[PDB]
Design a protein around this motif. Structure first.
Motif, PDB file in Angstrom:
ATOM      1  N   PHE A 146       0.802  -1.206   0.000  1.00 20.39           N
ATOM      2  CA  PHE A 146       0.000   0.000   0.000  1.00 20.39           C
ATOM      3  C   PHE A 146       0.840   1.264   0.000  1.00 20.39           C
ATOM      4  N   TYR A 196       3.244   1.189  -2.293  1.00 23.25           N
ATOM      5  CA  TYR A 196       3.386   1.138  -3.741  1.00 23.25           C
ATOM      6  C   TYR A 196       2.121   1.583  -4.455  1.00 23.25           C
ATOM      7  N   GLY A 197       0.967   1.428  -3.825  1.00 20.03           N
ATOM      8  CA  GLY A 197      -0.268   1.798  -4.479  1.00 20.03           C
ATOM      9  C   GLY A 197      -0.816   3.137  -4.037  1.00 20.03           C
ATOM     10  N   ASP A 198       0.039   3.993  -3.492  1.00 21.73           N
ATOM     11  CA  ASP A 198      -0.397   5.271  -2.949  1.00 21.73           C
ATOM     12  C   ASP A 198      -0.159   6.364  -3.981  1.00 21.73           C
ATOM     13  N   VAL A 199      -1.175   7.200  -4.192  1.00 19.61           N
ATOM     14  CA  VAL A 199      -1.094   8.243  -5.203  1.00 19.61           C
ATOM     15  C   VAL A 199      -0.306   9.450  -4.704  1.00 19.61           C
ATOM     16  N   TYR A 238       3.799   9.560  -5.332  1.00 18.17           N
ATOM     17  CA  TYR A 238       3.933   9.370  -6.768  1.00 18.17           C
ATOM     18  C   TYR A 238       4.618  10.577  -7.390  1.00 18.17           C
ATOM     19  N   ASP A 284       6.256   9.918 -13.581  1.00 20.22           N
ATOM     20  CA  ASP A 284       5.351   8.759 -13.599  1.00 20.22           C
ATOM     21  C   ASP A 284       6.011   7.536 -12.956  1.00 20.22           C
ATOM     22  N   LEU A 308      -5.325  -3.243   8.180  1.00 14.40           N
ATOM     23  CA  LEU A 308      -6.361  -2.220   8.147  1.00 14.40           C
ATOM     24  C   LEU A 308      -6.547  -1.539   9.497  1.00 14.40           C
ATOM     25  N   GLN A 350      -5.573   1.936  10.808  1.00 16.00           N
ATOM     26  CA  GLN A 350      -5.126   3.322  10.869  1.00 16.00           C
ATOM     27  C   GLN A 350      -5.494   3.850  12.243  1.00 16.00           C
ATOM     28  N   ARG A 392     -10.110   2.284  14.252  1.00 14.87           N
ATOM     29  CA  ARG A 392     -10.738   2.485  12.941  1.00 14.87           C
ATOM     30  C   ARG A 392     -11.434   1.211  12.443  1.00 14.87           C
ATOM     31  N   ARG A 404       0.125   6.031 -12.556  1.00 11.17           N
ATOM     32  CA  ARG A 404      -0.556   6.540 -11.376  1.00 11.17           C
ATOM     33  C   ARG A 404      -1.334   5.392 -10.742  1.00 11.17           C
ATOM     34  N   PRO A 405      -1.148   5.113  -9.456  1.00 11.37           N
ATOM     35  CA  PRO A 405      -1.431   3.767  -8.935  1.00 11.37           C
ATOM     36  C   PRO A 405      -2.848   3.577  -8.394  1.00 11.37           C
ATOM     37  N   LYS A 406      -3.843   3.742  -9.274  1.00  8.69           N
ATOM     38  CA  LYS A 406      -5.184   3.156  -9.144  1.00  8.69           C
ATOM     39  C   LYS A 406      -5.903   3.650  -7.880  1.00  8.69           C
ATOM     40  N   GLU A 407      -6.206   4.943  -7.888  1.00  2.26           N
ATOM     41  CA  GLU A 407      -6.881   5.561  -6.748  1.00  2.26           C
ATOM     42  C   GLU A 407      -8.330   5.100  -6.686  1.00  2.26           C
ATOM     43  N   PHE A 422      -9.574   2.281  -1.610  1.00  2.00           N
ATOM     44  CA  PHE A 422      -9.139   1.111  -0.862  1.00  2.00           C
ATOM     45  C   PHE A 422      -7.633   0.961  -0.838  1.00  2.00           C
ATOM     46  N   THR A 423      -6.964   1.215  -1.959  1.00  2.00           N
ATOM     47  CA  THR A 423      -5.513   1.134  -1.976  1.00  2.00           C
ATOM     48  C   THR A 423      -4.898   2.336  -1.270  1.00  2.00           C
ATOM     49  N   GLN A 424      -5.576   3.482  -1.296  1.00  2.00           N
ATOM     50  CA  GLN A 424      -5.234   4.579  -0.403  1.00  2.00           C
ATOM     51  C   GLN A 424      -5.847   4.424   0.974  1.00  2.00           C
ATOM     52  N   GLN A 425      -6.547   3.310   1.219  1.00  2.00           N
ATOM     53  CA  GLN A 425      -7.119   2.955   2.514  1.00  2.00           C
ATOM     54  C   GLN A 425      -8.085   4.030   3.011  1.00  2.00           C
ATOM     55  N   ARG A 426      -8.993   4.434   2.131  1.00  2.00           N
ATOM     56  CA  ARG A 426     -10.040   5.399   2.445  1.00  2.00           C
ATOM     57  C   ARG A 426     -11.375   4.692   2.613  1.00  2.00           C
TER      58      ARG A 426
END
Ligand SMILES: *[C@@H]1O[C@H](CO)[C@@H](O[C@@H]2O[C@H](CO)[C@@H](O[C@@H]3O[C@H](CO)[C@@H](O)[C@H](O)[C@@H]3O)[C@H](O)[C@H]2NC(C)=O)[C@H](O)[C@H]1NC(C)=O
Ligand SMILES: *[C@@H]1O[C@H](CO)[C@@H](O[C@@H]2O[C@H](CO)[C@@H](O)[C@H](O)[C@H]2NC(C)=O)[C@H](O)[C@H]1NC(C)=O
Ligand SMILES: *[C@@H]1O[C@H](CO[C@@H]2O[C@H](CO)[C@@H](O)[C@H](O)[C@H]2NC(C)=O)[C@@H](O)[C@H](O)[C@H]1NC(C)=O
Ligand SMILES: [Mg+2]
Lengths: 1135, 362
Positions: A339, A341-344, A347, A352, A938, A940, A1031, B3-6, B9-13
């Motif tokens: 997560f 790695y998958g955070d915008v 980035y 890119d 999960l 936070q 949470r 850009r990694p797929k917002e 869930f992956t941003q844990q929102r």
């Protein structure tokens, strides 16, 4: 040397020297079968070896050492497993036109294929190329795992080696190979193929250098595929042998975790010879009921010394719960690193490039960092050079206001009083131009308001102004390449960023330069191509420290040959020393204050470069170049003649002017350093710079704000003595007395007993700028390094300037060793790759022209402004999650597998179970081993936009309070409490043992009590994870309810099946009975009640910081901050 | 590009209710637990004080009894009703004979006459208690065979060595036949005969029937089925030899489809004492007064100082009577209440206020 043949089927039983497998190489597959013999021998069907009290040093040792590290590695056996098969293809086996080799299938990974590698395929070994589809074999090498650089160097197969290409021309070569062995090298290889033709049918050579040897650790980009034999093996590929120097064993948790497993075994072997002494007092009674209706021996010795086939049926079962733990954290740490790695928000949108984790193992060790080691050039400065200022014969017009904010420390002028003064002067540069083709969108050049009526036209100052102005763009190392998108724009690549800072500015200064060709270099006039040229080049080197050229200046008049002159530039070591007394430009009222105008440039923090000129002779102009072809360019370039000839005739040197080079910061660095240094992290800047432009930026990016001691080292000596006479020598006494004076001026704490230490953030703010040659004499011997540490330990943020690139890795080993403290090392460049590997977490900035500190890193953040988003969000989450679920795993096993022992006292320790044979299996696999994965993923504790706003929540990580052994011993005692509740609450229902059924029929088997015991244990330690996590949500709250009714739905399916003996109806007998549901609501309470009280007593009266924040967070203190927020960004408000 | 797929869930929102332990979510959670588990602790003991039992131990009835009626020495019986708190009309033994027909260590029909002043109301259950018979050892409870229980055939090796359950000591004699209920459970069965009716004595002589049909679950005959082989090469286990003195004929093959007091003994009781149901009566009520039953003694309990006995009861929805499961609610209720009025005795006088984040504002 080494032996590899072609087109053999590679047999197994052969020994012959035609054979390739008779060398006996290892594989790339560098256990599971030992786990199977555990589970079969554990309690039931296939017990291979249950010897008794002799395996007690055999099973406890293998799982803590030999099986921990097998599961711990997530890139040596996971990135080696999923890579197979890497495009196995079907052009195989049946093949025709004879003299054509019928293709074979050897193994999965082998030597002797013609198997291709397409785009995005990890290459299985080291390959030499044979054929492609493009022209001249237009492919290259990529540098993602083992190789390191950025550019795409073209590499060719030989022009008749590329005759074979089709699947009709695939099996049409044969030759034997000379190779080498293990060397622990990267860029060295020898070989030569005298290969066989396709067209001619004859045999012909091919020379081999290193550049055709691409490597295993690669993943191809931008091209479709290539061909080759799998030439070299995979088992000798040295990436796992070169990287890393450390085995990346993890941290203060997973190196102290294996001591926590042993305390579980030690406090469970005690309850096996309390069982042992209580089963020997049962045989010597003989008034019990074990003789009439039981048929055996009148003795003990069931297997050996009592009922030991039960006792070693529990030890071999409780040796599966540490095996389940190591699989439990290598799904959590693989997800906590997936997560990031998958955070915008981590980035690099300009490039890119997400924050790619180069180690899926460690994320927890981010959350307990308290030393950040950096580098000024590259990692907290922008690391593009640009040209700002210049002095020309005395006049230095206009000041681009960038770094007079610390020379004027006491106030900054960027508000309206100095920026908008010069922003209007920047608008005064850009609103009009005198020459067209000035780009004016990316210029930011040496701004030029007017000199003589905005165009500059007896004024000899301008005559030698544009002489050097074109010369810094005429003669330089790199060549002006073209932009493929638009021909009007010209991009410039360089390995020296200062030298392309001059050329990119001088185009935008005026007389717009476009083409630097070996055909020539144009200057516009008359509409005809007036065009210049250079002869040769003189290379700037760090052994030379300066740069000249060899340029062509023509003979512009008929009947005469005029006189030329040559250029000189570089650093100011020997430039000011050679005086000028014979030329037209002498040391006068100009030359010293322009040196002061180059002395002033360092005081505002700029890379002071100079420009100069040369004298010669007229008839020696040909003699100066007639010895260069034989003595300089032929063989003796790298030898010491180029410095000798650059000192012989130039005994005195002619200086005119200088060029100022300035370096911006990266984005958000003075906010990130402000953010990290208040979180408790003493950050040290290890730079490659002198004092007054590393302490200049030290106030610019606000790590120094108030305190810095004025230090005068004033030495020029060395230390060749060690034994005695310490006050007799100048330098070793004076810097050490400087240590004790600034002890005794700030506190008499010269100290020898190092065993005192706090990890607390220091109270008095201090800062050290030690001077490179001082730390070499301070890290040298014993009892001087410890005087250096507790000085630097008592500071906010020290700085170490002019540090050698081996001394960077030595000062981070000093804090990591002599204190118990892990460190961080952030980097971009080959000068602190040793610093990255030294520290326990090495972050690395990526995307530049140098990336050796990227594939050797531990994380790969884009800019430095993501470091306070990686550490303070994704790092402190990975320690409040994982220092909680680790004691939530040694709690939920002894809530269950200690009632096997409590049904020993009601069984005379004779050895009957209490659970199914599938309630022992499916407990730590489906029932309760699912939600402790999701408290690890999960949870936070506070939100993503809240740990940035309040960074001081990270001080839980430094002080080691979320993880210590004393927290662990109050969760094993919490299992030892709740294993007398989950057992004796279904015992005291049966203790007078009536019927317990509404229908009166009764149910009192051993297995119908272990449905009363399991089902009030799985619920009373699934709520215990639900109650303790922060949470509660939609995904982890869902799969903590679908693990609460898998226990009610694995009874209702397996017991209703006839394959379960003793069982046909344990669904309706048990769950439809009102005595289950009346004790299910009491032992769920009595297991939660001694901790939901303590979690309410502690969170009211002695609270921690992580609930005080999240109860302000519901009053609405943090409402106005948006979701998707980071303060360390310029394009967003900070509010 | 990458850009990694917002996707929140992956941003844990993930949508998340974020619980905070204040004394606004806790004191309405301790008071609601303390008021439920007392009015459930009263509703259960209301149900579990009306439950009436009769427990009579008869293990010593061979030795310490007479041919005439003699009262039980009252360390061998106790029983409690909800209309008669103090009740001391003691029951009495009668040991009939030593009948001298292949006389064993322990035999002679002990006939117990008990006296109940109330009504075991609709379903009347006749259990039997067995104290100090440890039937939960490692080799004991793993010794039967599921092929014989489900009725099918058996080889010698299908019952001798099998995974888990195996008839490891008791699969063959010197003759080497297959025992039909092999295993130490079925070999050592409780074989005291019980009457099918409690006689009415003294007043009416209108008897009270007690069938043994439906003595355990209806969905249980699908694993206790009839046998598949009718062979003369099988014979009773070595303790059933008084009951079958000459082996299995073609007639005396035990159908364990409906031989239902054996289906209770094939679940070995899991503790010290053991109660298995043996006589039920789903038809009639039990009128009050006095009764007498006739237990034929065959089970030699006295050598390991154990016990046998009787447990005549009427069961609740909560089973039989046990003061634990009602009294542990009012322990589970009067502790969470006492930990509700300590965590407010301290909160009103310790008194933390929700403030700035401490230890970083120090
Ligand atoms: C069913 O009731 C019988 C009473 O007849 C229970 O007693 C067992 O009876 C057998 C048959 O006589 C005994 O075997 C014999 O024991 C004597 C020693 O007393 C020995 O000399 C003979 O060779 C023969 O082996 C058996 O010992 C006796 N049980 C005990 C514990 O002594 C029988 O247990 C009952 N079966 C059940 C409940 O399944
Ligand atoms: C096989 O043996 C059984 C008993 O072991 C015999 O059953 C008994 O038969 C007599 C005949 O009148 C009855 O009086 C008994 O009551 C029966 N026993 C029981 C327990 O009920 C059976 O008869 C024998 N088989 C043959 C063919 O004689
Ligand atoms: C009801 O019980 C009576 C009981 O009376 C005696 O019972 C014994 C043994 O049960 C028997 O041997 C006697 O013949 C009986 N009569 C006398 C006068 O002693 C029995 O008659 C039956 O068990 C039952 N009878 C009916 C009609 O239900
Ligand atoms: Mg650098």
């Amino acid at each position: 040397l080494r032996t590899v043949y072609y087109n053999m089927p590679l047999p197994k039983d052969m020994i012959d020297e035609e054979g390739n497998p008779i060398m006996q190489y290892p594989r790339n597959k560098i256990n599971v079968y030992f786990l199977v013999l555990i589970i079969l021998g554990a309690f039931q069907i296939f017990g291979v070896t249950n010897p008794g009290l002799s395996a007690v040093p055999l099973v406890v040792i293998v799982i803590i050492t030999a099986i921990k590290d097998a599961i711990e590695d997530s890139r040596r056996t996971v990135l080696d497993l999923e890579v197979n098969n890497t495009k196995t293809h079907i052009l195989e086996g049946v093949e025709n036109e004879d003299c054509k080799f019928a293709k074979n299938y050897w193994k999965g990974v082998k030597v002797g294929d013609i198997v291709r590698i397409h785009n995005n395929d990890e290459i299985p070994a080291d390959i030499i190329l044979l054929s492609t589809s493009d022209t001249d074999g237009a492919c290259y090498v990529e540098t993602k795992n083992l190789d390191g650089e950025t550019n795409l160097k073209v590499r060719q197969s030989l022009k008749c080696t590329n005759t074979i290409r089709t699947s009709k021309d695939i099996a049409r070569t044969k030759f034997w190979i000379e190779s080498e062995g293990p060397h622990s090298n990267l860029y060295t290889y020898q070989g030569n193929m005298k290969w066989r033709n396709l067209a001619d049918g004859e045999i012909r050579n091919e020379p081999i250098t290193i550049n055709n040897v691409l490597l295993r650790g690669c993943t191809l980009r931008n091209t479709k595929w290539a061909m080759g034999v799998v030439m070299f093996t995979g088992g000798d590929t040295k990436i796992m042998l070169n990287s890393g120097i450390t085995p990346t064993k993890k941290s203060r948790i997973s190196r102290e975790l294996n001591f926590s497993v042993v305390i579980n075994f030690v406090l469970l072997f005690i309850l096996c010879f309390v069982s042992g002494i209580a089963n020997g007092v049962y045989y010597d009674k003989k008034g019990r009921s074990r003789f009439s209706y039981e048929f055996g021996t009148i003795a003990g010795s069931a297997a050996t010394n009592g009922f030991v086939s039960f006792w070693v049926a529990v030890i071999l079962y409780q040796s599966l719960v540490p095996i389940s733990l190591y699989i439990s954290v290598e799904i959590i740490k693989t997800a906590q690193a997936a997560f990031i790695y998958g955070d915008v928000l981590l980035y690099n949108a300009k490039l890119d490039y997400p924050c790619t984790p180069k180690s899926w193992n460690i994320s927890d060790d981010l959350g307990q960092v308290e030393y950040i080691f950096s580098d000024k050039t590259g990692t907290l400065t922008q690391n593009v050079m640009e040209f700002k200022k210049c002095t020309i014969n005395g006049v230095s017009y206009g000041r681009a206001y960038t770094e007079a904010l610390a020379g004027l420390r006491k106030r900054q002028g960027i508000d309206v009083e100095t920026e908008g003064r010069r922003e209007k002067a920047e608008i005064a540069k850009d609103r009009d131009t005198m020459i067209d083709e000035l780009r004016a969108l990316s210029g930011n050049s040496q701004f030029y308001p007017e000199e003589v009526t905005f165009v500059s036209k007896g004024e000899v100052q301008q005559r030698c102004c544009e002489h050097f102005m074109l010369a810094l763009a005429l003669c330089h190392s790199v060549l002006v390449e073209a932009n493929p998108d638009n021909p009007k724009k010209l991009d410039l690549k360089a390995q020296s960023p200062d030298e392309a800072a001059l050329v990119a500015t001088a185009r935008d200064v005026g007389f717009s330069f476009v083409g630097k060709t070996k055909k020539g270099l144009i200057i516009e006039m008359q509409g005809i191509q007036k065009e210049f040229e250079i002869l040769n080049i003189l290379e700037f080197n760090s052994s030379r420290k300066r740069m000249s050229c060899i340029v062509k200046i023509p003979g512009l008049n008929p009947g005469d040959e005029p006189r030329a002159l040559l250029i000189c530039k570089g650093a100011d070591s020997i430039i000011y020393s050679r005086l000028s007394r014979q030329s037209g430009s002498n040391s006068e009222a100009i030359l010293e204050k322009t040196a002061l105008h180059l002395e002033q440039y360092a005081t505002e923090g700029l890379r002071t470069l100079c420009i100069a000129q040369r004298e010669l002779s007229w008839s020696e102009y040909e003699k100066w170049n007639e010895k260069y072809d034989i003595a300089a360019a032929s063989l003796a370039n790298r030898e010491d003649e180029l410095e000798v000839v650059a000192d012989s005739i130039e005994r005195e040197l002619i200086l005119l002017g200088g060029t100022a080079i300035e370096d911006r910061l990266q984005d958000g660095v003075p906010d990130c350093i402000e953010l990290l240094a208040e979180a408790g992290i003493k950050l040290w800047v290890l730079t490659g710079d002198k004092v007054e432009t590393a302490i200049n930026i030290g106030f610019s990016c606000n790590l120094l704000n108030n305190e810095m001691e004025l230090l005068v080292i004033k030495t020029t000596g060395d230390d060749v003595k060690e034994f005695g006479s310490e006050p007799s020598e100048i330098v070793d006494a004076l810097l050490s007395k400087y240590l004790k004076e600034y002890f005794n001026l700030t506190g008499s704490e010269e100290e020898i007993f190092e065993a005192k230490k706090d990890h607390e953030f220091p109270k008095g703010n201090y800062a050290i700028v030690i001077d490179g040659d001082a730390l070499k004499l301070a890290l040298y011997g014993e009892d001087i390094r410890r005087k250096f540490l507790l000085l630097c330990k008592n500071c906010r943020a020290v700085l170490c300037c002019r540090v050698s690139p081996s001394q960077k890795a030595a000062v981070v080993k000093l804090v990591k060793d002599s204190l118990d403290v892990m460190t961080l090392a952030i980097g971009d460049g080959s000068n602190d790759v040793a610093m990255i590997q030294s520290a326990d977490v090495g972050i690395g900035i990526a995307g530049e022209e140098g990336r050796q500190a990227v594939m050797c890193s531990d994380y790969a953040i884009g800019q430095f402004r993501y470091l306070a988003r990686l550490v303070l969000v994704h790092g402190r989450w990975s320690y409040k999650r994982l220092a909680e679920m680790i004691p939530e795993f040694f709690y939920k096993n002894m809530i269950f597998a200690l009632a096997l022992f409590w049904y020993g006292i009601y069984n005379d320790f004779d050895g009957s179970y209490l659970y199914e044979y599938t309630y022992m299996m499916f407990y730590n696999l489906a029932f309760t081993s699912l939600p402790v994965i999701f408290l690890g993923i999960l949870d936070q504790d506070v939100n993503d936009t809240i740990s940035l706003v309040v960074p001081q929540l990270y001080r839980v990580g430094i002080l080691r309070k979320e993880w210590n052994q004393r927290k662990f011993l109050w969760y094993m005692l919490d299992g030892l409490y709740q294993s007398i509740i989950c057992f004796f609450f279904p015992y005291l229902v049966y203790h007078k043992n009536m019927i317990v059924t509404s229908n009166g029929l009764g149910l009192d088997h051993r297995y119908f009590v272990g449905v009363y015991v399991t089902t009030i244990a799985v619920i009373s330690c699934n709520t215990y994870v639900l109650l303790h996590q922060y949470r509660w949500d939609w995904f982890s709250g869902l799969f903590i309810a679908l693990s609460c009714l898998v226990v009610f739905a694995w009874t209702g399916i397996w017991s209703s099946a006839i394959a379960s003996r003793e069982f046909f109806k344990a669904a309706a007998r048990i769950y439809g009975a009102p005595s289950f549901w009346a004790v299910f609501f009491v032992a769920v309470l009595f297991c939660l009640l001694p901790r939901f009280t303590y979690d309410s007593f502690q969170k009211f009266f002695y609270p921690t910081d992580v609930e005080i924040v999240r109860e302000m967070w519901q009053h609405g203190h943090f409402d106005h901050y948006p979701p998707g927020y980071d303060p360390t960004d310029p394009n967003r408000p900070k509010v | 590009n990458r850009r990694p797929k917002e996707d929140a869930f992956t941003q844990q929102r993930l949508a998340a209710i974020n619980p905070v332990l204040t004394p606004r979510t806790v004191l309405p959670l301790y008071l609601l637990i303390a008021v439920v588990f007392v009015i459930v602790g009263g509703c259960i003991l209301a149900q579990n004080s009306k439950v009436d039992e009769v427990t009579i131990y008869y293990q010593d009835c061979m030795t310490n009894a007479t041919s005439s009626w003699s009262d039980i020495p009252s360390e061998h019986w106790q029983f409690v009703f909800h209309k008669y708190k103090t009740y001391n009309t003691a029951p009495q033994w009668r040991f009939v004979d030593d009948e001298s027909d292949d006389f064993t260590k322990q035999r002679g029909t002990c006939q117990i006459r008990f006296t109940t002043p109330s009504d075991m109301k609709n379903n009347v259950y006749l259990n039997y208690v067995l104290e100090k018979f440890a039937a939960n050892h490692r080799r004991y409870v793993l010794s039967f065979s599921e092929d014989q229980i489900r009725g099918e055939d058996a080889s010698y090796e299908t019952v001798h060595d099998a995974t888990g359950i195996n008839c490891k000591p008791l699969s063959k004699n010197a003759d080497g036949k297959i025992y039909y209920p092999c295993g130490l459970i079925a070999n050592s069965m409780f074989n005291d005969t019980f009457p099918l009716q409690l006689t009415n004595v003294g007043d009416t002589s209108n008897n009270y029937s007690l069938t043994n049909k439906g003595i355990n679950w209806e969905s249980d005959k699908k694993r206790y089925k009839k046998t598949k082989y009718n062979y003369t090469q099988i014979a009773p286990p070595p303790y059933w030899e008084k009951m079958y003195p000459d082996g299995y004929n073609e007639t005396n093959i035990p159908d364990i489809q409906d031989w239902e007091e054996f289906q209770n003994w094939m679940r070995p009781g899991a503790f010290d004492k053991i109660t298995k149901l043996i006589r039920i009566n789903k038809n009639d009520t039990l009128p009050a007064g006095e009764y007498q039953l006739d237990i034929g003694l065959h089970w030699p309990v006295l050598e390991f100082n154990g016990k046998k006995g009787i447990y005549l009861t009427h069961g609740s929805h909560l089973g039989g009577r046990n003061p634990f499961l009602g009294i542990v609610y009012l322990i589970g209720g009067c502790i969470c209440a006492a930990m509700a009025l300590i965590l407010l005795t301290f909160w009103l006088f310790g008194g933390r206020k929700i403030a700035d984040a401490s230890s970083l504002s120090w």
